[PDB]
């Protein structure tokens, strides 16, 4: 069979219908089969797993670091071949996922330097694009191609030249959609052409495209309709769907408007579970 679980940030995966009050914020939502691989990823980047009816049923992975926390979550049979990782700094790494799969509890996939963390995962896709953004909205686009499978001691490589005050808060693949949804954490939305952000080599400093101070958390392609799964700080996890048609075209110099009305609660996650 399977079973349906919210992994959270601190490690616990619990199925959906059975979240407590008191919890870390939710990660994604997957429904696993009992035949499957779960894999978690951390900031430290780190990679835990289980398998299996009775691990479903209720876990927490033991996380090998003080302040250790999930950034992404897959099944593995349900997941590319190669693994894309983004860091704080602006790294970008490249790992197949036989390097690593079904290894020990915790096993470290990629070398940090002083200070950086893992922000975000993505599942590989050749021939595509990159698109690398940071919290103050500048976005990096580059082919896929630029970042050279590697083996778990690797650091990989610059993705994107940081300003000062800037992080990196996540990557995205680009396949050929016209359209992107510029996400803030405070729930404002516009959609932008993909030809706002012009394809360059990879280190570059990027394109400014969300046209506030609110943090850029994601920059969704779209190409007719998308369905998220989006969580928050406070503890929710709700889905939306939104057709292209339903927002009016804006450029990289829009302000986004509000869609979620979120008060004193952030977006922290945005999940793409359809897209046509």
Same mark, same amino acid.
């Given at each position: 069979g399977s079973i349906t679980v919210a992994v959270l940030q601190d490690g616990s995966i619990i199925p959906v219908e059975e979240l +407590? %009050? !008191?919890?870390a914020p939710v990660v994604n939502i997957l429904r696993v089969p009992f035949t499957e691989g779960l894999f978690l990823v951390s900031n430290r980047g780190r990679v835990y797993w289980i398998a299996g009816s009775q691990a479903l049923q209720g876990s927490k992975v033991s996380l090998k670091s003080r302040e250790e926390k999930i950034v992404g979550a897959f099944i593995r049979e349900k997941f590319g071949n190669r693994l894309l990782l983004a860091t704080k700094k602006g790294y970008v790494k490249k790992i197949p996922l036989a390097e690593f !799969?079904? *290894?020990?509890? /915790?096993? +470290?996939i990629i070398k940090l330097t002083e200070g950086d963390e893992v922000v975000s995962i993505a599942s590989s896709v050749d021939e595509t694009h990159i698109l690398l953004f940071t919290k103050k909205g500048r976005v990096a686009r580059f082919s896929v191609r630029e970042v050279p499978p590697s083996t778990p001691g690797a650091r990989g490589v610059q993705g994107i030249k940081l300003e000062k005050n800037d992080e990196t808060s996540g990557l995205r693949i680009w396949n050929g959609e016209p359209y992107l949804l510029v996400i803030t954490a405070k729930g404002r939305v516009k959609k932008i052409s993909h030809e706002e952000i012009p394809k360059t080599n990879r280190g570059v400093k990027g394109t400014e495209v969300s /046209?506030? *101070?609110?943090? %850029?958390v994601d920059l969704i392609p779209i190409k007719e309709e998308v369905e998220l799964l989006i969580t928050t700080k406070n503890g929710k996890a709700f889905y939306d769907k939104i057709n292209q048609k339903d927002i009016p075209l804006s450029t990289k110099k829009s302000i986004p408007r509000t869609r979620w009305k979120l008060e004193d609660d952030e977006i922290i996650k945005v999940v793409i579970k359809k897209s046509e």
């Open positions: +407590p %009050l !008191e919890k !799969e079904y *290894k020990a509890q /915790g096993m +470290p /046209g506030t *101070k609110d943090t %850029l």
